[PDB]
Amino acid sequence: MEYLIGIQGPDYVLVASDRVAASNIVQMKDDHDKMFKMSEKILLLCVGEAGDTVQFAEYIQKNVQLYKMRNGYELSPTAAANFTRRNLADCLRSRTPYHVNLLLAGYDEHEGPALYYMDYLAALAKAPFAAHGYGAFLTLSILDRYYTPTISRERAVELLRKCLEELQKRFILNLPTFSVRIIDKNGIHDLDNISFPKQ
Amino acid sequence: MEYLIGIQGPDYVLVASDRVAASNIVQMKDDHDKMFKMSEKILLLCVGEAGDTVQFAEYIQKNVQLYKMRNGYELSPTAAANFTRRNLADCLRSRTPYHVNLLLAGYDEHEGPALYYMDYLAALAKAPFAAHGYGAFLTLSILDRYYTPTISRERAVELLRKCLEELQKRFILNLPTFSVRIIDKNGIHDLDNISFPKQ
Amino acid sequence: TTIAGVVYKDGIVLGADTRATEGMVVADKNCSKIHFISPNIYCCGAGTAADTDMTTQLISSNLELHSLSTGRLPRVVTANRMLKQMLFRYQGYIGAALVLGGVDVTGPHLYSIYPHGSTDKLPYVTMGSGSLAAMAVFEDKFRPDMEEEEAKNLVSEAIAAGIFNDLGSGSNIDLCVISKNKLDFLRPYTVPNKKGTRLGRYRCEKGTTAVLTEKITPLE
Amino acid sequence: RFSPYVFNGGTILAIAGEDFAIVASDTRLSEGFSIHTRDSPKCYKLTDKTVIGCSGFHGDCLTLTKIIEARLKMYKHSNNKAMTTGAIAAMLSTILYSRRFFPYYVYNIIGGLDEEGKGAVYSFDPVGSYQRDSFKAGGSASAMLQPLLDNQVGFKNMQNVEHVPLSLDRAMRLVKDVFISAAERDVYTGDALRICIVTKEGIREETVSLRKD
Amino acid sequence: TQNPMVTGTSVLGVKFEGGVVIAADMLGSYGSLARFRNISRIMRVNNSTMLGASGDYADFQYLKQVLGQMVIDEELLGDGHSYSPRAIHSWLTRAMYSRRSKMNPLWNTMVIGGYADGESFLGYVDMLGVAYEAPSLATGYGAYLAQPLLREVLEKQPVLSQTEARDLVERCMRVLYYRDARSYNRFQIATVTEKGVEIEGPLSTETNWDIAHMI
Amino acid sequence: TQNPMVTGTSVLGVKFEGGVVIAADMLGSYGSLARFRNISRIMRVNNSTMLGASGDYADFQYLKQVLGQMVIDEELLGDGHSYSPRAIHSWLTRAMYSRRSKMNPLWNTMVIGGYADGESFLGYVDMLGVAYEAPSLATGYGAYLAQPLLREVLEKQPVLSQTEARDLVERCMRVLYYRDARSYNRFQIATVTEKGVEIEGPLSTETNWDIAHMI
Amino acid sequence: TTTLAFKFRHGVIVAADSRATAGAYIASQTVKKVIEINPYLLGTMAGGAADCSFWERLLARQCRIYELRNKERISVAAASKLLANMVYQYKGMGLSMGTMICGWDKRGPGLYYVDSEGNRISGATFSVGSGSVYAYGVMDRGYSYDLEVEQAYDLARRAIYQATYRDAYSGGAVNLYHVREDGWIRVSSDNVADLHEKYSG
Amino acid sequence: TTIMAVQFDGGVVLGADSRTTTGSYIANRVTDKLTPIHDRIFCCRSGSAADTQAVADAVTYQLGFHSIELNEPPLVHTAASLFKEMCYRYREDLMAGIIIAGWDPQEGGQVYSVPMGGMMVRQSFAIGGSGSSYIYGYVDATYREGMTKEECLQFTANALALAMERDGSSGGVIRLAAIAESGVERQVLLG
Amino acid sequence: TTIMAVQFDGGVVLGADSRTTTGSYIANRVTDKLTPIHDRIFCCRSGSAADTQAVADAVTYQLGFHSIELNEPPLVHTAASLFKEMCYRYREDLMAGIIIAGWDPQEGGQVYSVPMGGMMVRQSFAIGGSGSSYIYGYVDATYREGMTKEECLQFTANALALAMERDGSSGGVIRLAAIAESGVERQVLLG
Amino acid sequence: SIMSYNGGAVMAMKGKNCVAIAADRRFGIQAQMVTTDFQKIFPMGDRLYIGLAGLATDVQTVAQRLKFRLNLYELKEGRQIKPYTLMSMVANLLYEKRFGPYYTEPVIAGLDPKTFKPFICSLDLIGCPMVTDDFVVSGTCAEQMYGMCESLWEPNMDPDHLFETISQAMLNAVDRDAVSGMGVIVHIIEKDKITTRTLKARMD
């Protein structure tokens, strides 16, 4: 229903999102934030059931903040991704099934950048690019077309421009404004809000 | 699903439409035309079932063109609107139910301008403004707010600007470009294509 | 699946095929549907294959625990009482069709156990999908107090009737003879069907397959 | 309630040769878990150069066979000639579509020579689509026979394998081997293997036994 | 017919040297109730062919009415022709298939035994238009019970005499009296030869209950 | 209880001057089958109160077991107290309401007649916890048939003697023998007074069939 | 199943895959999905194979009779109108048909789109199939009206390749036709396994 | 509903109850179950109420028209054939339990049975209805070949009394009919 | 399935068939329907197969433990009370048709009936099972108060033979049991 | 079905003195692939592997629960695990979830930890073991894999022709399947070394 994207580089992770909080037919909030800073080098979006997206991001946030506060250092993005897959798979066979769909985007000091994938059936997948929502059916061709494993981040933003102009050409949705982060050796950096003017 | 509007003036009928031909999740055609010139002073949009919208407009088109070709003069907009209500109400109780939703917009030489309304249950309603689709739930407040029975057509286009800027603010749809006609004592006049730029 | 058993004048003869199907595709050409319980009692299973396997091991574990405590030989009515009480508690959700047979101090005893808990003491039983074919062989050609070689002819005839008439059956025939002292277990007894020879040489030599990336890891 | 359909079984194989056509089928007619008979071939000599196979629901197979046999005679009394191989496949597609909303449950394969003496195999579906192929296998054991002939006849997925045309004698042992392997894993594959060979000189039949389980 | 009210049960049939023997019992049942203890389930078509049936009995009286008329219709021509047992088997197949195609079938299962031109014929007819030929036929639970007894002897010895075949049916009818819940100890045996069609009377079996003392 | 197996039928009751009379029949039915021709459907609680019931009979034996114990429990105290007929009517109401609140009701319909302190009591208890008081009660089809006969006399004359009330029940039990499909010509009449509880024997009615000659 | 069609300065380009499946089982790899109607018209296949094969064959029957009576080839908008009226009579009975109509006309190029749901729209670019959404994105990034002939071949060729690479039901071989003013012409028929080695480097 | 029919040497003996129900309510105390089609041929009807009244009028229409054209007394087997043709043709729409009995000059007394399916069979004694299931054991042991007329009137009286006692559907009053060459005798009993 | 129980002066007489079915297939030709709980108290079981075998083991467990603690022969009414407590408590999960009969020193022969509901009643003769519906009329007219033992063995033999003949569910062979003060006599008949 | 949600195929084959196992590489959701590097073969000690197919949740779940119990077994005892011991261990772990079952079908291949003796088996989703002597298969495209190995397997085969037989068995069966593909990895292990190769398959 809402769209995310996962361009992975050689030493950087380029993630983007949308800012639309949907409703019945109307658009209540148009500057929503799907992002959740877990640590200094690990981000977390979320897509899924409207009550479930908030609390599981809040639940995974604190348990990772326990690890840094007790042991004095940060989780790796690999160990962080495999802690999330445990909690969804355990309480899947339960009276309260869980329904969210989101990866991780992390930078390791030893292993460099990394990108994962997650379904609501809790399956992990190391991937060089990924997407969710219905826009994945219209953008995984372009991002497969114009891809290079040794791409630069200036081309990657320009590649993200190509991925986003096909969104507001053949959709039945609105999706005006898109928020973008970037993760490197120096941590979380906020790029500008990618938007499309109306007039 | 798609949006129409029916601003009625003292001596003019201002109608507008959209140009989007929808699909599953994609937008196949973005310069569609819902309009059907029945005669020199009677127009006809259509909204409904994807197979039914074309043929009933084609069926009502020819039977009105028979009347002008046999008797040598045009139907009134009142007699034209009541011919359409007969054909939907007759074949409603049938093995092939009919599912479309559209009024008429006509100018009489004696009675002046006129605007009707139609449901898929075939009910007529003389109205001073009307709308269909889900956008009627977000525009019948503004058009009730800034209305005057003695409004001028320059204000009416400006009123149509106010009606359309609230569309691309709180929707879950795209709807970029809107086609506009105007009917007067001189017949059908085509105004410019109202659009909203992307960049 | 076709299992059967009979009580002759000195012991009990059991038999089955070795086909285990899956859907409509033969999954196992040589299965094993005769199980160990005690040195005098065996059991044949039918129905859900994992439900018969996990049940027949628990009772055989309990009777080994029971007989080693008593220091004696188990009785067939003990194994009957455990199975009809366990399967009744699970309300028939565990689908296990069983044939229970053994020789006690009291002599030979044969039982049939249905997956709800109903049990029957009979001189001869059939269970399984092709059980109707083997039962027609029994009623046509039964007589009481047969000998051992007459009974081994009868069961191997009845199991073969379910082979050539039922789709779910058809493989090599198992037998077992349990008597007062002798215990015989025959994993092949009669091979009714073979596989035809391969006529065409289909082998292309080494190098006819494209390989992208190889990797070698030595061991010790 | 009264359900009008049931599955019977059978497996049909056709191979388009260079100047021949081989049609093979088993003879088991089963229903549910039981065997009705062990002698029920699926081969039907339509003309001197065309053999059809029919699988699926057996009541529709007997009906659909007798419809085609009438229209062959209706062609000949109206046109003073016999139908070709492709003309029968074009006629059959309209017959299968003619009951679009109450369909036959029948998988059809037509093999035979063309008007130039080459093997032609036309596969079908229960609604009416068709195409010309080099080899098809239809019926219950259709999934166990298609990928093997891709390796042998199609010569796919092999490096440095030459493309020799399939001879007549090499094609005979290819048919006799695949039904042995199909009879091991399928429960519907029966006992007698009726093999019809359509050449430019007539139609030869041949029966090979399988395992009787 | 959507619901069979009064039903029959298994019908047996097997070829022998110069003829076909067919046996069935004489019971009509309404559910678990054995309501009609004395009915006939075998129709003697004219001289060389013969019919027995299972399933709904009210539909069987309908086909008894129709087939009875068609045999009279050719005899009144008097041209020296008759219906072969294969032609009746071909006719009855098209009757079933056209009936089920209108979603209103005839709840039966019919066995046709015939002997013409020195050729024993034995044909099967299903409700769903399934038809074939076999040296031995069985309907209902007899296809599960008596059919393994029929095929075992015939695959050992292909041909049979008349006395061998007649005794073998009485053994199979005995077994069906034990294991079928809706059988009855009163049956009749009908046999075609080159001399014509002959139907025997209400015969019965002899059971064995010596295993009842074994607890 | 989700399915009543063996059921009773209509139970009548009406007050009079110094007592309550209650009558019911002696039949237990399993569907249309009149299986148990001889059962008792009236329990004599200790000295001043009295119970009859309709609905499922196996549930009635359960409440016969429980109420029988509670009366013994107070008599063993011996403090000079007893349960009033209203207190049993109050107790039995809470038993029904708590039972239906667990979605597992007791399929009954109970009538309590009592006479204590010179006061005739007549109480109703439904399966759904509906309870009230009335000068005349009727369950089942008796609420459709005998209840118009009861209210017609009582609204004309409010009080009744014992012989007037006893004869009027026999007229209503006669009418229920005609028009109820699941009634029986064998009933018993139970009556409380100040002298105690007395239950009469298996009485019967006298029908009239003179209209059968009228075609 | 993945088809696409687009018109430009030099006519219309039509491309499609060749795989037809049955549930999770692949029936064949060599299905000719672009149904050749005339020397001047082309039709596609979408969803129901026998439904698209029958009615387009029936559509060719009416176009031939129209030419014999009127001494003129039929127009592209005419043939799309006849097909929409025939399928509408069986509406709600479960027909699967989402084909396209291509051909040259006196008014220039012709491209229409007919569904089994009564849809009949014109346009410039289309993509039909289960893997159609993978073809819209790569084509619209590379589409222009002023393209060359060799340029328009390689755009439509890779666009089918990117669809079959992502989709499971699409695959096989890539057929490619070119509709010109005189009539259509077959361009090529390439295997996906051969294109994979081409676009790897 | 319980119907009864026993033939004897001279003719037949019919019998039925009188109770007509709806749900658990007696719609009618006394009801003529047996129906005079012809002067020598009766039938007793069971199953649906409105169906069996409509079928019995049409057979009386057809047999009455046919017998005058015969100028002959009709056969009992002829009348039972007409119920078979209607009940088999409309077996999807009817619930009829007809038993046809009556004396015939050619063949004496005859009893036929047409159950809900639409078949036809001749019997020595026929019972039907919902309450007929309770007297299968009594009617087998008590029946003896070679009864007089008065034994058959005693035979059917005890048979219907046991069904009325045990069944909740059957009851009311006992109606009898004795058809012979001499005439038709009808009576109403109790006990 | 047809079970039979008749008391007399000295004791009781039991009887049942032997046929055990599943659908329309005979799972077992001969079957002990009657069950020896105690040396003087039997029961004949009906309804489900696995349920009634499980209930009869638990009552034999409880009554056997209680009677040794009594150091007394148990009462027949005591044993019939134990079936009532189990069948009423688990009436949502069981289909049991138990008839309890047996001789008692305090009271002589007794026959109790516990149907599928869970109630209990004492009768002079009790029948049950699926085939018991066909012999309601026969058992009412034939029964006479004040029989000997040999008349009751004749009475139950004809009663089960009529049910076995008419019912498709019942059949097989006839097993009988006669419980008195002297002992228990068991036999197997035909006819 | 639930098994056909992600798809997959696992094949093992016994040779003369060596054993081989292979699987595909595609990870997808019902029409749409995601990646080509989803691991389905997991090492359990040396000269002994295991393959998993079915629902990708239970693939990653059971392979970690089995690894949980395996390291506890090899530390309480000093030795490694025998292949029969592992088959009884997996059949226990699936039968515990008798009514809430895991949707996977394991395949075990390996050698004797004492000799060169190979071992193959496969299990149901509830835990019925099944040992053979030639091959075991699992996954959605099961019937295509039976048609290969019944027509290509020979009893006594060197490690070269064993590699060539299991390669042609996978490349012809998986390309006939729709939801499985995108590369095949092949493990061929023996007494002295472990060889892992990746084949050149159709990427469509």
UniProtKB/Swiss-Prot annotation, chain C:
A GO BP annotation: proteasome-mediated ubiquitin-dependent protein catabolic process
Main location as per UniProt: cytoplasm
GO molecular function: endopeptidase activity; threonine-type endopeptidase activity
Compartment list: Cytoplasm; Nucleus
N-terminal signal peptide: none
Keywords associated with the record: Cytoplasm, Host-virus interaction, Hydrolase, Nucleus, Protease, Proteasome, Threonine protease, Zymogen
Coiled coil: none
Tissue: Expressed at a low level in colonic mucosa. Up-regulated in colorectal cancer tissues.
Origin superkingdom: Eukaryota
EC number: 3.4.25.1
GO cellular component annotations of the record: cilium; cytoplasm; cytosol; extracellular region; ficolin-1-rich granule lumen; nuclear body; nucleoplasm; nucleus
EC top class named in words: hydrolase
Function, as annotated: Component of the 20S core proteasome complex involved in the proteolytic degradation of most intracellular proteins. This complex plays numerous essential roles within the cell by associating with different regulatory particles. Associated with two 19S regulatory particles, forms the 26S proteasome and thus participates in the ATP-dependent degradation of ubiquitinated proteins.
Protein name: Proteasome subunit beta type-7
Gene: PSMB7
UniProtKB/Swiss-Prot annotation, chain D:
Main location: cytoplasm
InterPro entries to which the protein is assigned, alphabetical: Ntn_hydrolases_N, Proteasome_bsu_CS, Proteasome_sua/b, Proteasome_suB-type
Keyword Nucleus carried by entry: yes
GO BP terms: proteasome-mediated ubiquitin-dependent protein catabolic process; proteolysis involved in protein catabolic process
Compartments it resides in: Cytoplasm; Nucleus
GO cellular component: cytoplasm; cytosol; extracellular exosome; extracellular region; ficolin-1-rich granule lumen; nucleoplasm; nucleus; proteasome complex
Modified residues (Phosphotyrosine): Y122
Gene3D superfamilies in the cross-refs: Glutamine Phosphoribosylpyrophosphate, subunit 1, domain 1
Residues bearing glycans: S30, S181
Record-listed N6-acetyllysine modification sites: K176
Keywords from the named record: Acetylation, Cytoplasm, Deafness, Glycoprotein, Host-virus interaction, Intellectual disability, Nucleus, Phosphoprotein, Proteasome
Pfam (any one): Proteasome
Summary of subunit composition and partner proteins: The 26S proteasome consists of a 20S proteasome core and two 19S regulatory subunits. The 20S proteasome core is a barrel-shaped complex made of 28 subunits that are arranged in four stacked rings. The two outer rings are each formed by seven alpha subunits, and the two inner rings are formed by seven beta subunits. The proteolytic activity is exerted by three beta-subunits PSMB5, PSMB6 and PSMB7. Interacts with SERPINB2. Interacts with RFPL4A. (Microbial infection) Interacts with HIV-1 protein Tat.
Family: Belongs to the peptidase T1B family.
Official protein name in the record: Proteasome subunit beta type-1
Swiss-Prot record, chains E, F:
Superkingdom, taxonomy of origin: Eukaryota
Subcellular location: Cytoplasm; Nucleus
Induction: Up-regulated in fibrolamellar carcinomas.
Keywords (A to Z) from UniProt: Acetylation, Cytoplasm, Disease variant, Host-virus interaction, Nucleus, Phosphoprotein, Proteasome
A Gene Ontology cellular-component term: nucleus
MF term (GO), any: lipopolysaccharide binding
Biological process, per Gene Ontology: negative regulation of inflammatory response to antigenic stimulus; proteasome-mediated ubiquitin-dependent protein catabolic process
Modified residues (Phosphotyrosine): Y57
Quaternary structure and partners: The 26S proteasome consists of a 20S proteasome core and two 19S regulatory subunits. The 20S proteasome core is a barrel-shaped complex made of 28 subunits that are arranged in four stacked rings. The two outer rings are each formed by seven alpha subunits, and the two inner rings are formed by seven beta subunits. The proteolytic activity is exerted by three beta-subunits PSMB5, PSMB6 and PSMB7. Forms a ternary complex with SMAD1 and OAZ1 before PSMB4 is incorporated into the 20S proteasome. Interacts with PRPF19. (Microbial infection) Interacts with HTLV-1 Tax protein.
Sequence similarity: Belongs to the peptidase T1B family.
Entry protein name: Proteasome subunit beta type-4
Lineage: Eukaryota, Metazoa, Chordata, Craniata, Vertebrata
Residue range from the parent sequence: 46 to 260 of 264
UniProtKB/Swiss-Prot annotation, chains H, I:
Enzyme active site: T1
Functional note: Component of the 20S core proteasome complex involved in the proteolytic degradation of most intracellular proteins. This complex plays numerous essential roles within the cell by associating with different regulatory particles. Associated with two 19S regulatory particles, forms the 26S proteasome and thus participates in the ATP-dependent degradation of ubiquitinated proteins.
Protein name (record): Proteasome subunit beta type-6
GO BP: proteasome-mediated ubiquitin-dependent protein catabolic process
Keywords tagged on the record: Acetylation, Cytoplasm, Host-virus interaction, Hydrolase, Nucleus, Phosphoprotein, Protease, Proteasome, Threonine protease, Zymogen
Family: Belongs to the peptidase T1B family.
Inducers of expression: Down-regulated by IFNG/IFN-gamma (at protein level). Up-regulated in anaplastic thyroid cancer cell lines.
Subunit annotation: The 26S proteasome consists of a 20S proteasome core and two 19S regulatory subunits. The 20S proteasome core is a barrel-shaped complex made of 28 subunits that are arranged in four stacked rings. The two outer rings are each formed by seven alpha subunits, and the two inner rings are formed by seven beta subunits. The proteolytic activity is exerted by three beta-subunits PSMB5, PSMB6 and PSMB7. (Microbial infection) Interacts with HIV-1 protein Tat.
Localisation per UniProt entry: Cytoplasm; Nucleus
Phosphothreonine modified-residue sites: T35
Documented EC number(s): 3.4.25.1
